[PDB]
Amino acid sequence: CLTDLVNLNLSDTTEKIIAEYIWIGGSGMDLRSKARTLPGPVTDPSKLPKWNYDGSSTGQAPGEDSEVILYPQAIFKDPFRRGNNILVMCDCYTPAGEPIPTNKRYSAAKIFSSPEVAAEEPWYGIEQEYTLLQKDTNWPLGWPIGGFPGPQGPYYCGIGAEKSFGRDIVDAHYKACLYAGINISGINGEVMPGQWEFQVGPSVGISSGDQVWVARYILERITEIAGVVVTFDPKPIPGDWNGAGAHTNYSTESMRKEGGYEVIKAAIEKLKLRHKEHIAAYGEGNERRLTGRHETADINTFSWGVANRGASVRVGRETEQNGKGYFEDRRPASNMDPYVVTSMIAETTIVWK
Amino acid sequence: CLTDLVNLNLSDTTEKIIAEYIWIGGSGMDLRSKARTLPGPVTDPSKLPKWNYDGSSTGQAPGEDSEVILYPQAIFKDPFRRGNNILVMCDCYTPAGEPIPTNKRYSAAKIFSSPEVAAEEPWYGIEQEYTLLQKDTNWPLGWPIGGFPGPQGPYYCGIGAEKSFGRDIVDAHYKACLYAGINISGINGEVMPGQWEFQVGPSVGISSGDQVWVARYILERITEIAGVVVTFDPKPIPGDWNGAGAHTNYSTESMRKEGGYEVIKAAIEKLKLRHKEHIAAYGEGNERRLTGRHETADINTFSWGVANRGASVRVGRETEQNGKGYFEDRRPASNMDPYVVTSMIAETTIVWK
Amino acid sequence: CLTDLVNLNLSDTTEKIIAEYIWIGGSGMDLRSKARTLPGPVTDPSKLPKWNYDGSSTGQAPGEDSEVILYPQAIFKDPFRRGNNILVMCDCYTPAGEPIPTNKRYSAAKIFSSPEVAAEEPWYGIEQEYTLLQKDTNWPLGWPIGGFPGPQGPYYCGIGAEKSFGRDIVDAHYKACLYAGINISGINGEVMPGQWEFQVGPSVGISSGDQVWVARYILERITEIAGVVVTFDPKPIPGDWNGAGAHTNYSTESMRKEGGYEVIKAAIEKLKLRHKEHIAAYGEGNERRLTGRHETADINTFSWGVANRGASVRVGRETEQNGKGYFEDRRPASNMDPYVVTSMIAETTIVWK
Amino acid sequence: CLTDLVNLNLSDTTEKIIAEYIWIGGSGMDLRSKARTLPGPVTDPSKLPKWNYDGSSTGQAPGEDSEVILYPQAIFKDPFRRGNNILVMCDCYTPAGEPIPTNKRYSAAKIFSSPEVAAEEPWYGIEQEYTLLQKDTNWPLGWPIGGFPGPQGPYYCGIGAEKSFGRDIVDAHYKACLYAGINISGINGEVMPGQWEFQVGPSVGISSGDQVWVARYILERITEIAGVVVTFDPKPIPGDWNGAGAHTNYSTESMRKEGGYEVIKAAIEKLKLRHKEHIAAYGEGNERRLTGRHETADINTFSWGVANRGASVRVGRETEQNGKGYFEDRRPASNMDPYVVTSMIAETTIVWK
Amino acid sequence: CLTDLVNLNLSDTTEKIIAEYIWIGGSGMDLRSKARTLPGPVTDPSKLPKWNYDGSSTGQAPGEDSEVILYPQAIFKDPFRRGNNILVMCDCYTPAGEPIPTNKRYSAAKIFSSPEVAAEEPWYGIEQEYTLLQKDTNWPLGWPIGGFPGPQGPYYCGIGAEKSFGRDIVDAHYKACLYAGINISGINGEVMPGQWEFQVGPSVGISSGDQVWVARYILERITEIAGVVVTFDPKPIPGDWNGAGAHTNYSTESMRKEGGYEVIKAAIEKLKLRHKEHIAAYGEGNERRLTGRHETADINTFSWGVANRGASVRVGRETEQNGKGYFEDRRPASNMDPYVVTSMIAETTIVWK
Numbered sequence A, B, C, D, E: 001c002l003t004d005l006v007n008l009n010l011s012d013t014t015e016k017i018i019a020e021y022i023w024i025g026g027s028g029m030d031l032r033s034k035a036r037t038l039p040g041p042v043t044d045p046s047k048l049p050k051w052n053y054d055g056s057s058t059g060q061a062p063g064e065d066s067e068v069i070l071y072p073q074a075i076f077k078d079p080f081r082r083g084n085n086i087l088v089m090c091d092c093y094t095p096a097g098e099p100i101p102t103n104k105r106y107s108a109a110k111i112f113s114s115p116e117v118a119a120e121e122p123w124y125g126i127e128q129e130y131t132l133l134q135k136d137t138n139w140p141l142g143w144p145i146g147g148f149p150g151p152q153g154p155y156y157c158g159i160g161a162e163k164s165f166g167r168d169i170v171d172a173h174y175k176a177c178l179y180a181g182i183n184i185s186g187i188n189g190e191v192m193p194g195q196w197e198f199q200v201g202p203s204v205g206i207s208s209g210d211q212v213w214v215a216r217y218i219l220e221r222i223t224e225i226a227g228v229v230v231t232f233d234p235k236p237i238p239g240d241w242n243g244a245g246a247h248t249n250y251s252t253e254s255m256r257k258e259g260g261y262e263v264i265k266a267a268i269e270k271l272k273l274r275h276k277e278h279i280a281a282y283g284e285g286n287e288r289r290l291t292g293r294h295e296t297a298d299i300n301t302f303s304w305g306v307a308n309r310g311a312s313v314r315v316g317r318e319t320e321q322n323g324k325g326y327f328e329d330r331r332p333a334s335n336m337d338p339y340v341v342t343s344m345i346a347e348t349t350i351v352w353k
């Protein structure tokens, strides 16, 4: 029946290829996509045709002047259609070639191109935490309707049918991402029951944002299959339950080299000064997350420390002991735009003085 | 058990083949089919025997003179029975060789054979929108019974279990169509929840209508497997919900060559003059769809524009900018007979002055 | 779990074979079977041992003298057990070598051996119509309990979840039958919702009866897997709903040769004279079917005509136009014994004057 | 628990009274109501205070000028709250004393006051047919979901759990109407399963319209208790199922006196001449009901006859044989406004020449 | 809520009365009724108005000449509406005063008026057996779907949840009938599970038929309330399960007086002679009941005996021992028309020689 058809191997019958064009909609947080047939395999982004879509259905264009343009930027293998089919992360433009206001890749790309940034070759490890919900009731997976599971404690990295909710989805996503070519560094179950995490492992400059977005796309397509809902809301349940962040781990060339630790403290120092303006771009609703409790620092203070999960920024024991490595910006919410967060960190850290 | 037998590979046991003969029934909108065993593989339509059926059971002949004749016209591979089995799009005649009144293939074939049309080598891209319904209640897939989902907005090209209903069926159809040999160019999720679209990519003359009908047959067979219902009704839910069109994209030899844009405007001009008569053949119920809202033009006016989804006809930014390409007739309803629409466009556009 | 064991491939472990001996029970309408292990593959009926069964449990013998004897007559591949396992159509005899009263194969074999019949080499194509029922309620598949679907119209050769009920079973049976080696010429969905048809394609003399019985066995074993019931009752639902025939298509050597049409009319003429006595053997309950409505002729009249589905006998347009072919006896009920009907037609048509 | 409170007898504790003010909403077909406490029992309409409501929530006034005024016209006992509590049929006016466009009681009252009409003292017997539906699916009570009961025949005036659906509601409404003071002349089960009827027995002039509206109000409140829905749609199910009328039986002083039959034919004659204009005011959707089949006359012809349920107007055998009585106008749909229909009949029949 | 309204006591608010007019429809076996409001209490049939109904909806008149007339013949108290409300058993006529073909009361009344019959003052005791079915499946109450309870034996006059199905209905009916004024002589549970019986105790002439029909009306109204179905089919389940009769117990003046036993035998002797003709009028389907088994006599033989439940006619031990009493005609089926059976017995027994 139905999976026989979804899983048909096309290679036996044509050279033709399906490409799923993915872009970001009007809200800056909604992923959209559609698919087209291409005459054969393609491995290079610039050999893919540009395309358009109805921007008036995605809050990005008026009905009378409706076309918005898609620029292929990155190709991944499609873990759903498989074979030689592909996913294509895109970028949005007016027909005149202007980037639309919700296109944040463009600015970010500029910054990562700028030669004093490219020289420093910045690395990002982003930790995407999210929460699984039951469809329709919108109540976290594995929670009884109108009630609560036992208090936090056993759920973090836990095992067992009463502790761990949705591993199916997580493991499927892990492999799907690896198969697609995403640099996914690992996964864990989080503190709040029904909450999980994956890491997009050290990725350079613009490709970090590209990868996180596609990772997100893949996640949500998987939950879709499973009949479950995902939120990237930073604090889906009020009270004594963890919120969801997108910790950004960061290092430059000079930070991972001998006596890098000194560059790190300097970079932290710059971040301290631009705290306010980073907060404003670090995802909406973050006030409900960053309270100083539940392994967050208060939104209003800035702090840093060594193995300190209460601080705005944390430096690993490992990198302290080696006088070189990376640090962790814990401030960004799970609904953060990685293009924005990632480039803004480069800018505050290299360019600005 | 049951899928073991449905999916038996016959190649291991005979050379015999199964052919599913498909035709259009008394309503002009109802697909019918039955199957016969043939001695071996066949790749050419004209090497298939003719056949008949009981026309008195399909509203096409009286009981006393019941036989109606099937002319094989197009062969595709059967994505359900797989192996060497085939689907066979047919054409209906009286035993005297007359095309019956519901046979619209015949006229259309005439027009596409006529040499000044064939010279122009017309291309059609038809965008089949349709809606998925729950069996028995006839209420759209994913909608709560006697209620409504959230307003339009997030559904168009959306992902997620709360946004996207029926992707299973859509992806299955996609591959089944490609495997079968249909020139399907792409798919997207539409504006109304539960509404979807596939495109029968640029196809020449008569084979456009053949391919759309078979595409439809395959869709409805797939929904049948899934226990879900399809309508091609152009406005299945009244109120603030999109209707369903079958946009017909169109280009001639001279339209896709240098300074083709002028030929396009000329063609549009001709269409403006025969609006009334096209409307009459553009599918029934269209009055309930073409209202000027929900990305339609009002039935009574005719208009055109560049990136204008409010217009009767739209021309891509792409083809404007290159002074050559195709245009989109947005007027035909989802329940349009592509034979009638496709040929009538050629006729108003090439033959008539 | 359970299908892993049912689908075990025995070829990897022994040369041993399973043979399912099929026979006809005390009612003349009830198929029975049991299975024995045989030392290795067998392709010829006469190399299979005879066997017996408890006739006192099938209405065919008393308890004190309970053994009845099975004579292998035809071999087919077992589509259930697969590998080298086989189904074996049988014939029933007293231990003294007498055919039992419910054995109608014996008479039929006699007639088909008789040299003036064998010379004429008669061909049968029987159209087995049947109805699928919900278990326990015995109400047709797809019909709401204590209610009715929409009126007849859309169901004949239809597609769609609202029109087409049980295609699963029908498609599985089609392949099962092909794999088995039954000469199945095709299938269609019938006029009454939940009613279906298959054809056992042109088969010579005694092997027509053999194949139809085995086709029936295979059908009912499939319905058993699906948890659905089949009737061959000629009129399962009173009122404005089609009954179920087993149309017998027929032709002799001389009918399919030049000026065969004349032999056909002559044959029809002879049938007209023995209408009463054919009816009496054409299946019980037929009075509820043959009413002159729903594509039958009244039991009391005999008539014939060209494309006439209201007649007792029909001749295809195709065979009229070519002055040679076959004709359709529409009179037999779906619960007809094909041994009786098939041989009686030969007898009234060749032997008797 | 809950019925203990709904059924509390207030007479034991205060003299206070609850009055439910009923009026007709912006669509002219939607009943609305609210309740207020009054210091003691009231038996005369003119001793009740006027009141208002938010017209902007009923499509009868803008938000900035929202008040619409209610004029008490008739009092009935409240069968729900019981005791001395009352229902109050109302009339709607601008604060300036203008009747609003949806107030059709005003015109009707004028006509029934006019002295040549009051002299003739017209009587109305209106037969309100309606259909019960399952909540959410909107499919008729007692029908299986996505299916149909057996054909019409046994349902009209039938008894039995398989024939009769919703008697509870009907019998409760019968008594509730009698207790309230409505002159309800009787009830019957109608032709279509789930369809029922009550008659508002001979009522003079304006009180006929008042009583039918209140009878409707009571009905719908009862269905609300039972968790069932009512339509007054004139043809709720397409096809071979009866529609719903509101036959208006009519007689004047001179029609019920000696040789009244002659006056009757004359009146019928005047109605024949104004058929077109009556139709236009006889309820919307009537085209779907008045087809000439299912005991209707075609909308386009006008006819009359003695015991003729095929006619536009019918005269009883009883009144023919006595040369005096009344006649039945069968034309009005069940969603008819009885104020409009009732007065329009008086006008065409007495006033106009 | 709903029973509060159905059970409203109207005596507190008007003198008005509800009268349910009951009649027999086109099949001769289907009860019909509707209700009208009357100005006050009525105890005498001849003071009730005649009425009519739509005969074209009950198979008793054409649409163009649709009125059929109802003559009140007997009054009973209405056990559903209670208070002073009434049931009214009616008789059907053309507007010309002719009894319609399905009116069997008329003939019967003639016979019971004829003075040599009235002198003899005949008494009837009819034993109405019937069977309770589950709605929709039509399978007997208490029987598992698609299965059978334990064999007959414990059910006849049994008690306990596993033996006795529907007593609710039966005890309700008993009281309702007594309250209504029907001369119900008693009840018992019958041999077949879900089968029951009541007796309409010694009633004179025409009133026997009247009372049985009303008892039947009351029964089916009660089953309606319970959501269960009744058949009066004489053999609802084939096989080793009892059928249902309507035994008619009978005596004349001279049979209940001294040496009445001689008159009895003489009467039985006359019945023997007209067996064939009685059978023809004793209800349809009786061939399936009267088999000689399950406490019946074979249809083709006539027999009688003393305590013999295998005989066509039985005489009680009591009346044998006293040489005077009554006898039991066991031949009539449960779907018998008591008007026909009752009068035909008087005729064969008194009038004919």
Ligand SMILES: Nc1ncnc2c1ncn2[C@@H]1O[C@H](COP(=O)(O)OP(=O)(O)O)[C@@H](O)[C@H]1O
Pocket (backbone or CB within 6 Å): A123, A124, A125, A126, A127, A185, A199, A200, A201, A202, A249, A250, A251, A256, A325, A326, A328
């Ligand atoms: N030098 C580096 N610069 C930036 N990111 C790094 C560097 N080294 C490792 N990472 C990445 O940082 C992320 C650390 O993730 P995780 O181990 O989940 O953080 P935590 O230890 O707080 O949970 C990983 O994606 C990892 O691959």
Ligand SMILES: Nc1ncnc2c1ncn2[C@@H]1O[C@H](COP(=O)(O)OP(=O)(O)O)[C@@H](O)[C@H]1O
Pocket (backbone or CB within 6 Å): B123, B124, B125, B126, B127, B185, B186, B199, B200, B201, B202, B203, B247, B249, B250, B251, B256, B325, B326, B328
């Ligand atoms: N020159 C052309 N003539 C006809 N069809 C074309 C031409 N170019 C592309 N097409 C086809 O037209 C269809 C494009 O419609 P679609 O992708 O749904 O765009 P939109 O949604 O904006 O109307 C596809 O079938 C595509 O292959």
Ligand SMILES: Nc1ncnc2c1ncn2[C@@H]1O[C@H](COP(=O)(O)OP(=O)(O)O)[C@@H](O)[C@H]1O
Pocket (backbone or CB within 6 Å): B053, B054, C123, C124, C125, C126, C127, C185, C199, C200, C201, C202, C203, C247, C249, C250, C251, C256, C325, C326, C328
């Ligand atoms: N000459 C013949 N003799 C016997 N059977 C034949 C002959 N020619 C065709 N047939 C068979 O008769 C059957 C035709 O059945 P079908 O198409 O169901 O009949 P219908 O015309 O009633 O649709 C098939 O078995 C076909 O192979």
Ligand SMILES: Nc1ncnc2c1ncn2[C@@H]1O[C@H](COP(=O)(O)OP(=O)(O)O)[C@@H](O)[C@H]1O
Pocket (backbone or CB within 6 Å): D123, D124, D125, D126, D127, D185, D186, D199, D200, D201, D202, D247, D249, D250, D251, D256, D325, D326, D328
């Ligand atoms: N003279 C009359 N004038 C007006 N209405 C009358 C007159 N006599 C009786 N009626 C009313 O006419 C209505 C008859 O309705 P109904 O019993 O439904 O008739 P039918 O079903 O035959 O059309 C009742 O309300 C009854 O009270």
Ligand SMILES: Nc1ncnc2c1ncn2[C@@H]1O[C@H](COP(=O)(O)OP(=O)(O)O)[C@@H](O)[C@H]1O
Pocket (backbone or CB within 6 Å): E123, E124, E125, E126, E127, E185, E199, E200, E201, E202, E203, E247, E249, E250, E251, E256, E325, E326, E328
């Ligand atoms: N003399 C009589 N004439 C007519 N009916 C009588 C006479 N005596 C008693 N009956 C009635 O005969 C019926 C006997 O019914 P029941 O007791 O069910 O009989 P059985 O013993 O056959 O079951 C009762 O209706 C009883 O009132």
Ligand SMILES: C[S@](=O)(CC[C@H](N)C(=O)O)=NP(=O)(O)O
Pocket (backbone or CB within 6 Å): A127, A129, A191, A242, A243, A244, A245, A246, A247, A289, A294, A295, A296, A309, A330
């Ligand atoms: C376990 S946690 O400290 C908790 C993160 C928390 N959900 C937050 O709001 O950032 N994340 P990690 O330890 O992986 O850095």
Ligand SMILES: C[S@](=O)(CC[C@H](N)C(=O)O)=NP(=O)(O)O
Pocket (backbone or CB within 6 Å): A054, A057, B127, B129, B191, B242, B243, B244, B245, B247, B289, B294, B295, B296, B309, B330
């Ligand atoms: C989004 S829509 O514009 C809307 C079509 C709409 N369903 C209609 O009725 O035409 N389809 P497309 O954008 O592919 O042209």
Ligand SMILES: C[S@](=O)(CC[C@H](N)C(=O)O)=NP(=O)(O)O
Pocket (backbone or CB within 6 Å): B054, B057, C127, C129, C190, C191, C242, C243, C244, C245, C246, C247, C289, C294, C295, C296, C309, C330
């Ligand atoms: C559509 S029908 O005519 C239906 C015939 C009906 N079932 C009968 O023969 O009883 N059968 P076919 O078309 O195969 O001859």
Ligand SMILES: C[S@](=O)(CC[C@H](N)C(=O)O)=NP(=O)(O)O
Pocket (backbone or CB within 6 Å): D127, D129, D191, D197, D242, D243, D244, D245, D246, D247, D289, D294, D295, D296, D309, D330, E054, E057
């Ligand atoms: C039985 S009917 O004739 C049918 C009325 C139908 N519903 C109509 O007027 O469309 N009603 P009535 O007998 O009350 O006049």
Ligand SMILES: C[S@](=O)(CC[C@H](N)C(=O)O)=NP(=O)(O)O
Pocket (backbone or CB within 6 Å): E127, E129, E190, E191, E242, E243, E244, E245, E247, E289, E294, E295, E296, E309, E330
């Ligand atoms: C027990 S029985 O004899 C059974 C009668 C059976 N139902 C029949 O007459 O068909 N009824 P009763 O004892 O009242 O005469």
Ligand SMILES: [Mn+2]
Pocket (backbone or CB within 6 Å): A127, A197
């Ligand atoms: Mn982490």
Ligand SMILES: [Mn+2]
Pocket (backbone or CB within 6 Å): A127, A129, A190, A197
């Ligand atoms: Mn974490």
Ligand SMILES: [Mn+2]
Pocket (backbone or CB within 6 Å): A127, A247, A328
């Ligand atoms: Mn971290």
Ligand SMILES: [Mn+2]
Pocket (backbone or CB within 6 Å): B127, B197
């Ligand atoms: Mn499109």
Ligand SMILES: [Mn+2]
Pocket (backbone or CB within 6 Å): B127, B129, B190, B197
């Ligand atoms: Mn579209």
Ligand SMILES: [Mn+2]
Pocket (backbone or CB within 6 Å): B127, B247, B328
């Ligand atoms: Mn389009």
